[PDB]
Amino acid sequence: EVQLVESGGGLVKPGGSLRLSCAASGFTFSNAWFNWVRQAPGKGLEWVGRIKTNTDGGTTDYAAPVKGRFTISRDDSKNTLYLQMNSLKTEDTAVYYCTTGHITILDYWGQGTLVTVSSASTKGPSVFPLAPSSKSTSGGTAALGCLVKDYFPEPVTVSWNSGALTSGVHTFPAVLQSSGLYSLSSVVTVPSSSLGTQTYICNVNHKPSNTKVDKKVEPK
């Protein structure tokens, strides 16, 4: 099966630079033309640029808003595609996708990598329990959660029981506080009887700040 694995996104200051990578398998890389496409948070899809095969000259072309600042390249010996992003602007904030399909029908997409362009500094979150109680139960089911407060930039990943607990989880979209920091909550609904057995732990990872926190969530 075709695979396209991206990496390289993160927080960068305006005027700074970043290199994204897209590692491919499952097709003849040297015969593929590639496109990068981006999607700003909550917005639509915007083409970024294209690179041809070496047979077709290896030529690149770019969307007008990034021309002169971005450079696409390819390393056929590593089956990896790159996007070098210079002179970064706040409006470059987006999830960046590598794609391929030659006629431009975008049939294969990487998973996306988020680039945030901002002058604000990274900050890891504080993690607090949302304790289950008589006030969070109905019909044999109980809700419990974690509140992930005051972090920057997006994203955080919230797991439960180191990933072993997945059903009944709702991780809400972060809200932007007037402080310029994000907060979110993650809740899970479980059988009330399992609260007398089981420890519930929320595992919070904020990769931009290298912050990992595990918080036990006990009834109150």
Binding site: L106, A131, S138, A143, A174, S185, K220
Partner: protein
């Protein structure tokens, strides 16, 4: 540049009913040499890249269910889901590849399930002692598994209505049961929290009268 315009911006259809979405191009994408329209449709679910559904305006991608079909020609196109399934909730994009640089996408149409009214389960969570030690108190109200998305949450502290000190966010429509969940956070100073009953009052179509969920800090 060929501009792609989609309508409507959002469509809600009952399970098993027909859903149709429109796409218009600012100029024809029909090539007279062959007799092909250079138009594709994509489906994008939360947290995922877009997925190719239809190309040449009407050819289904391999592996795409039969209920997806495309039609139209020249300047105006439609995508049809002949029997909408709960998992089909997604944003759908058209794309032209007739006039390369730049390939362009429509703005997207959000397809949602219309289902019967479902009232929320309302739960409330007090602040943790760990957060109180830091100077702030967050109280969280959870509305779980409700439909439609519209809901009003009012916070009261010692029966006094609050404003300006809460934020909320809502999940995307559940791909299984087509409901929503909502989290609202009331943020107060530790001092203010210690000087006062905390209540979340919820108004929603599925309720005959507002539901109030509350606790007494004295007994947490």
């Amino acid at each position: 540049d060929i501009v792609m315009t989609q309508s409507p911006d959002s469509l809600a259809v009952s399970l098993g009913e027909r859903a149709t979405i429109n796409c218009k191009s600012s100029q024809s994408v029909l090539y007279s040499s062959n007799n092909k329209n250079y138009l594709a449709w994509y489906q994008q679910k939360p947290g995922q890249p877009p997925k190719l559904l239809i190309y040449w305006a009407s050819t289904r991608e391999s592996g795409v269910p039969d209920r997806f079909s495309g039609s139209g020609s020249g300047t105006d196109f439609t995508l049809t889901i002949s029997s909408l399934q709960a998992e089909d909730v997604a944003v759908y994009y058209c794309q032209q590849y007739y006039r390369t640089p730049p390939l362009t996408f429509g703005g997207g149409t959000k397809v949602e399930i219309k289902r019967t009214v479902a009232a929320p389960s309302v739960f409330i969570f007090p602040p943790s002692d760990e957060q109180l030690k830091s100077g702030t108190a967050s109280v969280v109200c959870l509305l779980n598994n409700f439909y439609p998305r519209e809901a009003k949450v009012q916070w009261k502290v010692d029966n006094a209505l609050q404003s300006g000190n809460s934020q909320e966010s809502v999940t995307e429509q559940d791909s299984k049961d087509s409901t929503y969940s909502l989290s609202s956070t009331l943020t107060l100073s530790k001092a203010d929290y210690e000087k006062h009953v905390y209540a979340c009052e919820v108004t929603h179509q599925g309720l005959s009268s507002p539901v109030t969920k509350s606790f007494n800090r004295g007994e947490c």
